[PDB]
Amino acid sequence: ACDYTCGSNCYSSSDVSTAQAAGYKLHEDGETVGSNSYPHKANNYEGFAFSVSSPYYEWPILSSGDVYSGGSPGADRVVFNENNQLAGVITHTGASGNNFVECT
């Protein structure tokens, strides 16, 4: 069983924790990776019911189990805050264009 399902993609809690820690370390040192500048501000245009406070930052979570360091992001993103608390895991899979849906 998947703890988070993003279209076809299966994610456990450890997958989410490894991706989040990588994302936060880079946020605090003011560094970014890749061509789209990861991590950046997750603005929340969709209006999701995140039980943690604002501002929100998005970072890629890869299907292969590897951490992001440059190149292709994929469809899936883990959202954390300024406190290093998980907001949720979102995806562009099954959403129109550059929009998002929450992972089930």
Answer with the entry of Ca ion, ligand 2GP, none that 35 interacts with (C-beta below 5 to 8 A by kind). none
> Is 40 tagged catalytic?
yes
> Of the listed 40, 46, 82, 102, which one is catalytic?
40
15 binds, among Ca ion, ligand 2GP, none (CB under 5 to 8 A by kind): Ca ion
For ligand 2GP, the closer of residues 1 and 80 by Cβ is: 80
Task: State phi, psi for 10 to the nearest 5 degrees.
Answer: -110, 125
Contact assessment for residue 59 and residue 19, using Cβ atoms and an 8 Å cutoff? yes
Specify whether 92 is catalytic: yes
Cα angle 29, 11, 75 (rounded to 5 degrees) comes to: 70
Answer for which of 13, 28, 32, 65 binds Ca ion (CB under 5 A) is 65
Going by C-alpha positions, the residue among 82, 89, 100 that lies closest to residue 14 is 89
| 27 contact, one of Ca ion, ligand 2GP, none, CB 5-8 Å limit per kind | none
Active site residue 27: no
Q: What angle do CA 28, 13, 30 make, to 5 degrees?
A: 10
Binding site for Ca ion (CB under 5 A): 15, 65
